[PDB]
Each structure stands twice: as C-alpha cells, then as structure tokens.
Amino acid sequence: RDPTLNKTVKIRQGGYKGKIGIVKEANGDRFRVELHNPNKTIPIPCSF
Amino acid sequence: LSNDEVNSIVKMKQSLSSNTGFNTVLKKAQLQEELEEARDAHDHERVARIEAELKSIGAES
Amino acid sequence: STTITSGLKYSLATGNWGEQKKAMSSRAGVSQVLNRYTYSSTLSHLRRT
Amino acid sequence: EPKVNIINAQDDEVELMLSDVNLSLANSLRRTMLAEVPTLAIDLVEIKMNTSVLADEFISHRLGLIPLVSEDVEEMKYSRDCTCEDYCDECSVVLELSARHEGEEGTTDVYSSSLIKVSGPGNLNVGEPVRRDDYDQGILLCKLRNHQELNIRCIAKKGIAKEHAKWSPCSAIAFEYDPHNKLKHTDFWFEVDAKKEWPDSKYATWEEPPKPGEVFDYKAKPNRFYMTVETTGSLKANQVFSRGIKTLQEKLANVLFELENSR
Amino acid sequence: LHKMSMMAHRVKVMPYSTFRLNLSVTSPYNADFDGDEMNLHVPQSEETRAELSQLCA
Amino acid sequence: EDSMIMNQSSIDRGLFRSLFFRSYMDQEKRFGISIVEEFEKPTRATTLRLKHGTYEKLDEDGLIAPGVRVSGDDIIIGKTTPIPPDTEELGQRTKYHTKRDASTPLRSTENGIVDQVLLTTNQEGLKFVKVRMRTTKVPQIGDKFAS
Amino acid sequence: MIIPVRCFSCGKVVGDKWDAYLRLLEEGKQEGDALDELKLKRYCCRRMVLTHVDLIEKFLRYNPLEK
Amino acid sequence: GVKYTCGACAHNFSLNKSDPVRCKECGHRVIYKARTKRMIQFDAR
Amino acid sequence: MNAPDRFELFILPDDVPKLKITPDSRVPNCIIIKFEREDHTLANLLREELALYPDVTFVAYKVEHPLFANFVMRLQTEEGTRPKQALERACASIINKLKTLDHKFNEEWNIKN
Amino acid sequence: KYWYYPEFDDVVKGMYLRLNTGSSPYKVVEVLGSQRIKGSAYGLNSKENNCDMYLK
RNA sequence: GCUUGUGCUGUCUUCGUCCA
Ligand SMILES: [Mg+2]
Ligand SMILES: [Zn+2]
Ligand SMILES: [Zn+2]
Ligand SMILES: [Zn+2]
C-alpha cells in the first residue's frame, strides 16, 4: 500500500509533461498512471 | 419529506405557477384530450369553449 | 385486465405472436427492436415485410 | 550557382521559380516546409465549464486547429526540453476564453477573437490568434443559446506537423516542372491525340515549346521548378521559406556533427 | 476446406491492432482485406513448436 | 486486396472522426417485505465479495458523476444486497459482513468519459439509474469504409 | 454539425468564411460565384463549404439542461 | 451533499439519501446528477 | 490501443544512436549507414548529391517499413577516397547550396517588396 | 428553501431576523405569525421564484 | 502504528459479419 493510489497526479517531466492523471498501480517506483484524455495507461517513475 | 407532502408543495407551486413551457404543453395536451372526448360525445357547446380556451392559450412564437 | 395487458405486452416485447404458454410452435420475429444506427436504416426497418 | 526568381509576392502566398538546383533539393524543401517548420498551437485545454451542445473533445479539437502567431517561436523552447516545473513562460502561452449568452432569446456566436492572451514569453511576438484584419471576427468556434456558457483555459506549445497536422504552417504547396514534357517523365494517356486532349500548364508560356524537327535530348535533367507556398497566417510566406531552408541546414549539420563525433 | 488453411508462420511484433500477411499467402487462405478475420494458435511445448516449424510451415 | 490508404493529416484535421455513446442500466430489486437492494458505496468491512476494480470514483449515493474518466472494470454503479449475518456476532465491532456486492463495472475493453447520469424511479417504486459514457473514435488501420 | 476549421485535404482555414458565404448567397450570387468571391480555388476546399450541413441549428432548438 | 438538476425546469437542489427522487418545485420524476468538481483536461488533438 | 506515440517519429531515445556505420565486406571500400528518426527528406537529398560525385561508385537507400522511422544507406567509393569523407563533403556542399539559395531569396524578396 | 413546508409557519414564529426598513437602517423584528395572501405572488430571489408566503 | 480486498448465470429469440 502506497499513499498515492487513486489520487490525482500531474506529470512534470518527460514526453507527457503537464498532463493530469490518476495513479492506478504502484509497485516499485514505476507508478501506472491513466491519462484523462488519451484512453491509455502509461508507466512512469515516481520522480516525474 | 413524504410523497404526499411533496405532491402538496408541487400543487401549491402549480397554483402559484404563472406560466411554464412544459406545463403549458401538458395543459394543452389535456385540453386536446378533453376536446376529443367532447367531440365524440356530440357536445356542441363544450367544444366551442375548449376551442376558445385553446385559442387564448395558443399562438406561440 | 391483466390478461389482455400482459398478453399484448409479452407478444410485442418478445416477438412471439401467440399466447405465452403456447410459445413453442408459434410464429416468432413478428416484432423486432427498431434499428436506429442511421436514419435510412430506421426508414428501411419501418417499411419491411 | 542556385538562383531564385519571384513571380508574385504576398503576406500569405509567394509564387517563385527555382533554377540550377536538383529535383531532390526542391522536393526536400517542399517536404520540410510541409512537415518540419515549427509553429505554435494549442495543445492542452482545461475546461472549467461547458454547457453548450458540443462535446468537450469536439471543442478541444476545434481549438487545436486555430492558427496562432508564431513569428518568434524560434526563441521559445520545446516543452520536453524545458527544465521548469509544469508550464512556464519560456515554453508555453496561456489563452483564456469565456463566453455566455445574455438574454432569453437569440443565439451567440463564439469566435476565435474572443481568445485572450494571459501569459507568455516576455516581448516575443507569439500567442495571439491570427486575424486577417482589425474588424475580422475569426474562426467560428461554437454557438450558445440562453443559459449556456463556455469557460476554458488553453495552453499553446511549440511543435511540428510530424506530430500533428495542427502545427503545419502551410496549407498546400503547388509544385511543377517541365510543362512541355521535354524530359518525357510522363506518358500521356489519350484516345485520339494526346496534344489536344490535355490542358496546357499555367507555366507553358514560360518555356519554349519543342521544335517539330527536334530529337529527344537524353542528356537533359530537370532544371527549373515552379512552386507556390500558401500559409495559414501563422507565418508569412518568406518566413516559411527561410525557416525551411534553416531547418534543412540544421538537419545536415546534425548529421555532420554525428559523423565527426563518431571517430 | 484443406490443409493449407492452417499454416505455421513466424511472429513479428508490430504496432496497430491487425494481423499482417504477405499477399502471396492470401490465396491458400482464400482471404482478402475487406473485413476478414483470422485465428492464431500458440504452441506451449518444445515438441509442439518443432512439429509446427518442421511440418506445417 | 480491397485495402485502402488514408491521409493521416486528413485524419488529424477531422476526417471520419466520430462520437460513441454507451448507456448502462441498473435498479433496486425487491425480494421480500423488507429485503431491498441499495445504491451505496461499498466498504470492505461491511460488504462481502467485492470486485477487483476501483471504488474511489463513486460518490456518497453510490453513483459516479458526469465528467469523470473511466477505464475498464472500474465501478460506475455501486449496489449492495442484504445477507443474513454469520456467527460474526461472536464480536466484530465494525467489521462484520451483512451485505453482498452487486455493483456494475465498466466493460473491460472500453474506456471513456461519463457523459450523463440519470436518476429516477421505476413503475413499482424503487430507484432506477442510467449512466451514459462518451468516447471519440478516430480512424485507424483496420477500420471498415465503403462507397 | 458546425463548419470545420480546416479543409480535410490541404488544411486551408475555411472556418472563417461560413457567414460570408451565407451573406453572399443572400445577396443573390450563385454558389460557384460565391465560392470564387471567397477565394476558394481548389475544389477540395470548395467541397468543404459546398457540402456542409449545419446541424447545430437543430441541436440549439432544445431547451438547455442547466441554468 | 450531492447536487442534482431537474429534467424539466433545470432547478438545482440536494438529496440526503432519504427523500423521494422528485423535483422540489415542479415535481418531475426525472433528475440528473451535476458535473463533478475534479479537473478536466483534453489534449486538443 | 496499439497506436504508437506520434513523437516517436522524430524524438531519439537515449539508448538509440542517431547513426551506426558498419562495413560491407562483399565489395571493397563500402559501408552501411543506419539513420535513426529520419525519412526520405534527408535520404533522397544525400543520395542524389552523392550520385554526382566522380569518386562515388555506388549510393542507394531504402526505407524498410513505413511504420518505422529509419532508413539504411549503402555507399561505395573509389580506392583513394573513404566513404565517410564523401558523406561529409556531400553534407557540407548541400549546406553551402542552401546558404546561397537563402541569400538570393532574401535579396529578391527585399527587391520586390 | 423552506418556506413551503407546512411546519414552517410554526418554525418562523417568534424568530429574530435582520429586516430592511426601507424608510436604510436595518433593524430586528419579532415574527408574530405568517399569513398566505393569494394573488400577491412576488419574485423572491429570481424571476421564476414566485412566492405567496407573507410574514406578520 | 498503520497496512488492499481477489469474480459470474443459464435458455431461447432476433439482427448482423466473412466465406460459400
Ligand atoms: Mg472478404
Ligand atoms: Zn518551461
Ligand atoms: Zn483544400
Ligand atoms: Zn423541476
């Protein structure tokens, strides 16, 4: 259990900068965040 | 609120209702049903009054 | 009144054009869900035999 | 050795003739101007209220296609190359639209002139939506009746037409060479006579028609190329041509740098 | 209809959601690209992979 | 072989782009004099047999709100039915199960935005909900066209 | 539904010429002459304005759902 | 706690999971949930 | 669902080099160059510039698949010259041509305005 | 929100609320009761907010 | 001191898709 599951998040670095998302899966640093407009889920490190 | 209390409040505001498009359409439909009932009953006096009332209510834009 | 009401409602809802207990060996597909994918399809479904 | 001759010149279209260049160079210039010149376009839309009859993604798509002024977009940075947190003034432009219909009758039109620039790079001429005149209303975005309101906040970013066609500075580039078909690069379909069944090119009077007794010249190559560049208003035609040349030079210099660094 | 309706191919992972075929194999499958669909079966063993690669290729 | 090539720039500018709507329906069933299903947000303590999807997108009334993003399997309608409690009256202060989950998940292959949520009452008199989901479908390799 | 912003084939901005087109048709100009006046030369752009159906006018006749 | 909207007169109100599903003023039997408050973002493509 | 990101056509990954050169041992003095995140725009330009050089005996390119943004070039030169030097000369020559073309265009635009 | 309740007549009785004198220094008044007046419909908050309740 | 939950009906009918 991480305190960041099912919470609104924003991406600050990389090719998806400034996109609003929701954290769905968080095992080891590679948070899985669904994107509000593109109907897809992408992996991303917690640093971003 | 209960169902009876809500219906009483709705009837009270309907009495207060000066005009509302949905309610005017419903009233015009009910008047049309009453008019066809009067026509099918061969009542030549009621139908004139219903036609006059519909003419007064109608003529929309 | 439930006899006529339920019979008409069942026959129009399921398409079996007979009594509900007599559904076996009865005409089916007399009533179908209206097609609404496009306007022309609705017209065609309304003029079908 | 290469020569340029300009036939007609305008803010939004230039018609020129290229000579003493290779066909590949002219085609690469056309492709670069079509797909690789950077401009500014809306990329993120935050919708605070939308009670119109149009879906949110419908309006977002329409907003993406609005051409914005991109004159100083070379000094801006790419969003993925900016070290800033979220969006800053050096990699984005923020526009805001707020529309509403007042009264209980009639319909209100929402035009692209209603977009107001709120923030952007300091003293750079970027961000404002393009307008033909001062009294022009612009592109129709939506229509509103009573009690319907639209309130959005848009973010304009820098990009190229390879990622999405909304970033293309050009609409259509006419391109043509050899109007009299002396190089025999095409074989004309006909029923009776090819000469009178095919319309003459618009540059047919710019070149001498071949003599009847002339024989085919197998040593010739395409030499003169006619092209018209039409822009959407985000950039001027000369700006598009110069930036296409610059983009091609930068790509070649990057190749040369990779080659020298390979050692 | 015949044994050339099932043949063993080699996998190439590609983007987009369609299966991709060389056009010369469309005749034994009697297939065209106007809406047809085809099935794919994955072997689960070394012996079964060898059978596919040496008999049904 | 009847394939066609489409212009990607035309697709980007809006050629053959389309809107897709799907509606879901659910209602409270009556099983007995006092046995009624309830629209509510389930909890792992009081409710038994939950699903693998998420429940954080539901509101207090058990219904999702329009404008929210939904992925496959996510729960859009929360419904529970009562169940005669087990011997958990041996002592479970707030974590004894009395309900079974009967929620409606989104289809696993679909995702979109919630467009409109309808709440009303059926002919009998129990609650009745309809949720409509909206998404945009852009043409891609493998889509069917005809003249 | 509503006039597209860009031409599908080439991307010329045609979304600012719908009201002028309706004005020109009101004045009595033919459709081809009206399209010529708006400087739409390529038939790809002429198709966009000539074949557009304005469905938003029908959608706006339903009463708003929020006030 | 949760906002609604009437399907006929577009009136806003609230319910506490105990009132009948009805409009307060015109008594329509059809009501709609209000739009959420979470941030909504699109990619304009 | 399976659609790749559009920025992958031109954005170079960190672990993927822009340029990979391998020799072609079948014939003497030939190399195979693999260009990443490039297409016909650079390929055709370089090919038809190199094809006019007297010391270049073979030059060609191919884009293997349109769904992947890369092309591969084959280049063969004379004994005296090395193919990489010919490629550098071609790049410099096209840069010079574009420079004078831009100069003349600016001159003519200033004249006509 | 609550004027149409049947119990609102007894609820509002005896309450103290700020009142616009009009003739404006706001003052406090004591509610001696309420009386419905038919034909005296007035806009309460908006144009559609018709109300017949009156406070004595 | 605080720890993440682990799955699905049946039977008919109709309308469709690709071959034939
Ligand atoms: Mg077929
Ligand atoms: Zn920045
Ligand atoms: Zn066009
Ligand atoms: Zn109402």
CATH number at residue I17: 3.30.1360.10
Contact D59, D227 (CB under 8 A): no
- Domain tally, chain I: 1
Interhelix angle I83-112/D237-262, nearest 10 degrees: 160
Report the separation in Å between the CA atom of A37 and the middle of ligand 2, taken as the mean of its atom positions. Answer: 22
- C-beta separation of I61 from I72 below 8 A: yes
- Which residue on chain B is closest to J40 by alpha carbon? B16
**Residues 39-78, chain F, CB closer than 7 Å to nucleic strand K:** 44, 49-52, 73
- Rounded to the nearest whole angstrom, what is the distance from the C-alpha of residue C38 to the centroid of ligand 3? 28
The answer to whether A30 touches A45, Cβ cutoff 8 Å, is yes
Element of type H or E holding D251:
helix D237-262
Distance CA I106, CA J8 (A): 83
Can you give the distance from the CA of residue H26 to the C1' of nucleotide K5 in angstroms? Answer: 44
**What is the distance between the alpha carbons of residues F119 and H21, in angstroms, rounded to a whole number?**
7
Domains, chain D, ordered by start: 1-38+166-263 (3.30.1360.10), 39-165 (2.170.120.12)
Between chains, do G10 and D171 touch, taking CB under 8 Å as contact? yes
Interface of I with D in 80-109 (CB under 8 A): 84, 87-88, 91-92, 94-95, 97-102, 104-106, 108-109
Other beta carbons within 10 angstroms of residue F65's beta carbon come to 20
Cα separation, B60 vs F57, in Å, equals 45
Element (H, E) at I33: strand I30-36
Measured between alpha carbons, how far is residue A22 from residues A3, A15, F104 in Å? Answer: 13, 17, 21
Q: How far is I26 from chain D (nearest CA, A)?
A: 23
SS3 J36: coil
Q: Which domain holds residue G44?
A: 1-66
Ligand nearest to the CA of F3: 1
Q: How far apart are the first and last CA of chain I?
A: 51
Q: Which two tokens stand for residue I109?
A: 């635009």
CA-based nearest residue in chain F for residue A6: F56
Angstrom distance (rounded) from CA D258 to CA D262: 6
H26 annotated as belonging to a binding site for a ligand = yes
CB of F56 within 8 Å of a chain H CB? The answer is no
What is the residue whose two structure tokens read 């072989």?
A: F1
Q: Which residues of D are annotated as a binding site for Zn(2+)?
A: 79, 82, 84, 88, 90-91
Bridge partners of D45?
D154, H42
Residue of B nearest to H25 (CA): B10
Q: Considering only CB atoms, which chain B residues are within 8 Å of J5?
A: 9
Q: Per the residue annotation, which of F2, F26, F73, F115 is the catalytic one?
A: F2
* I69-86 burial: b if 16+ Cβ within 10 Å, else e: bebbbbbbbeeebebbeb
Chain A partners of D60 at a C-beta cutoff of 8 Å? 37
d(CA G43, CA G9): 10
Of A10, A17, A37, Cβ closest to residue D80: A17
Burial class of residue G40 in the structure, from the number of CB atoms within 10 Å of its CB (0-12 exposed, 13-18 middle, 19+ buried):
buried
Phi and psi angles of residue J14, each rounded to the nearest 5 degrees, phi first: 80, 0
Ligand 2 centre from D80 Cα, in Å?
8
F130 Cβ contact list (under 8 Å, min separation 6): F23, F24, F25, F117, F118
Q: Are F80 and F101 in contact (CB under 8 A)?
A: yes
Closest CA to A20 of A38, A1, A43: A38
Nearest-CA neighbor of G6 among G36, G34, G45, G38? G45
D246 token code pair: 């610059």
Contacts 24+ apart (CB under 8 A), D244-248: D244/D29, D244/D32, D244/D33, D244/D36, D244/D37, D245/D29, D245/I98, D245/I101, D245/I102, D245/I105, D246/I102, D247/D32, D247/D36, D247/D37, D248/D28, D248/D29, D248/D32, D248/I41, D248/I45, D248/I94, D248/I98
Residue E36 annotated as lining a ligand binding site: yes
Q: Which H helix or E strand runs over D33?
A: helix D23-35
| Catalytic-residue membership of F86 | no
Query: Which nucleotides of strand K lie under 7 Å from a protein CB?
Result: 3-8, 13-15, 17-20
Nearest CA to D146 out of D99, D114, D100, D110 is that of: D100
CA distance linking residue E51 with residue E44, whole number of Å: 12
d(CA I102, CA I108): 10
Contact at 8 Å (CB) between D115 and D95? Answer: yes
Which residues, including other chains, have CB under 8 Å from residue C11's CB and lie 6 or more apart? Answer: C17, C18, C30, C31
Domain boundaries, chain A: 2-48
Q: Which residues contact E46 (CB under 8 A, 6 or more apart)?
A: none
Rg (CA), chain C: 13
CA nearest G5: which of D178, B18, D139, F26? D139
What does each C-alpha distance from G36 to B35, D133, F52, G47 come to in angstroms? 57, 20, 62, 13
Taking CA G35 as the corner, what is the angle to CA G30 and CA G40, rounded to the nearest 5 degrees?
A: 165
CA angle D238, D242, D246 (to 5 degrees): 165
Show residues of chain H in contact with F68, CB under 8 Å: 36, 38
| Three-state SS at A39 | coil
Give yes or no for a contact between G19 and G9, defined as CB atoms under 8 angstroms apart: no
Residue-range definition of the domain harbouring residue I46: 1-113
Contact at CB, A40 and I1, closer than 8 angstroms: yes
Q: Tell me whether residues G67 and H32 touch, CB distance under 8 A.
A: no
CATH number of the domain at G24, please. 1.10.10.60
Asked if E35 has any chain I CB less than 8 Å from its own CB, the reply is no
Q: B46-57 and B21-40 helices cross at what angle (nearest 10)?
A: 160
Q: Nearest CA to I89 among I99, I81, I80, I101? A: I81
**Domain ranges within chain H, ordered by starting residue:** 1-45
> Which nucleotide in the DNA or RNA is closest to residue C24, CA to C1'?
K12
Asked if residues D173 and D30 have their Cβ atoms less than 8 Å apart, the reply is yes
Rounded to whole angstroms, the distance from the CA of residue H1 to the C1' of nucleotide K5 is 27
Q: Which nucleotide is nearest to F105 (CA to C1')?
A: K7
Q: Do H44 and D61 touch (CB under 8 A)?
A: yes
User: Which residues precede chain breaks (C–N over 2.5 Å) in chain J?
Assistant: 23
Burial per residue of D197-207, b for 16 or more beta-carbon CB atoms within 10 angstroms, e otherwise: eeeebebeeee
Q: Which tokens in the block code for residue G56?
A: 């938003």
Nearest nucleotide, C1' to the C-alpha of A3? K3
E38 is in an annotated binding site: no
Q: What is the DSSP string of G3-61?
A: --SB-TTT--B-TTSHHHHHHHHHHT--HHHHHHHTT--SHHHHHHHHS----HHHHTT
For C46, the token pair is 């309304």
Classify burial at F17, counting beta carbons within 10 Å of its beta carbon; exposed 0-12, middle 13-18, buried 19 or more.
middle
* CA nearest to H35 within chain G: G66
Q: Which fold has domain H1-45?
A: Rubrerythrin, domain 2 (2.20.28)
Residue bearing tokens 């003419």: B55
Q: Nearest-5° angle of CA I38, CA I44, CA I47? A: 110
Contact D62 G56 (CB under 8 A): no
- Any idea which nucleotide's C1' is nearest the CA of E30? K19
| CB C21 within 8 Å of CB C10 | no
Within 7 Å: CB of A1 and strand K?
yes
Choose among G3, G2, G9, G1: nearest CA to G43: G9
Helix (H, G, I), strand (E, B) or coil at F144: coil
Q: Residue written as tokens 């009463």?
A: G63
Q: How many residues belong to chain H?
A: 45
- Tell whether A19 lies on the interface with H, counting CB pairs under 8 A: yes
Can you read off the two tokens belonging to residue D263? Answer: 């050692």
Å separating the CA of residue D173 from the C1' of nucleotide K9: 62
Q: Which residues contact E21 (CB under 8 A, 6 or more apart)?
A: E29, E31
Number of domains within chain G: 1
* H18 shares contact with chain F (CB less than 8 Å): no
Amino acid at position B58, single letter: G
Matching residue, tokens 């909207």: H5
Is residue B35 within a helix (H) or strand (E), and if so which, with residue range?
A: helix B21-40
Closest CA to D175 of D23, D7, D39, D38: D23
Q: Rounded to whole angstroms, how far apart are CA atoms G62 and G64?
A: 6
DSSP labels for F18-82? EEEEEEEEEE--B-SSS-B-EE----TTTEES--SS--TT--TTSBPPTT-EE-TT-EEE-EEEE
The tokens of D58 are what?
A: 């419908």
Instruction: Please tell me which of the candidates F59, F67, F118 has its beta carbon nearest to residue H32.
Output: F118
